[PDB]
Amino acid sequence: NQSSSVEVSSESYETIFSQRIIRDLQKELVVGALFEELPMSSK
Amino acid sequence: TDETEEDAIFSLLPLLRKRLIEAHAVSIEEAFMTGDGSGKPKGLLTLASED
């Protein structure tokens, strides 16, 4: 701020940190799990 | 490995244990027969040679 008679030491007291996470839009899963699966028990 | 027990019809553990034990037995008998003195017990052949 640095305009008044009294000032703060640094921005870490001018700033508030949020503990939440955000993510962007991502590609969709289509061919991953559309076919049916064949169980196996050997090579 | 873990990708071999599934990659087989039948288990392979008893074979492993047996092979390890019999390797020990064969090695010890061979060493007592003619094991040299370097890091191995002296063999009867070596003992008779040095005497």
Determine the distance in angstroms separating the CA of B7 from the nearest CA of chain A, rounded to an integer: 5
d(CA B21, CA B39) in angstroms, rounded, equals 21
d(CA A29, CA A19) in angstroms, rounded, equals 29
Q: Do B9 and A42 touch (CB under 8 A)?
A: yes
d(CA B2, CA A28) in angstroms, rounded, equals 33
Any chain B CB within 8 A of the CB of A43? yes
Method by which this entry was solved: cryo-EM
Query: Which residues neighbour B11 within 8 Å (Cβ) at sequence distance 6 or greater?
Result: B5
Q: Which residues in chain A are closer than 8 Å to B8, comparing Cβ atoms?
A: 42-43
Q: Do B8 and A42 touch (CB under 8 A)?
A: yes
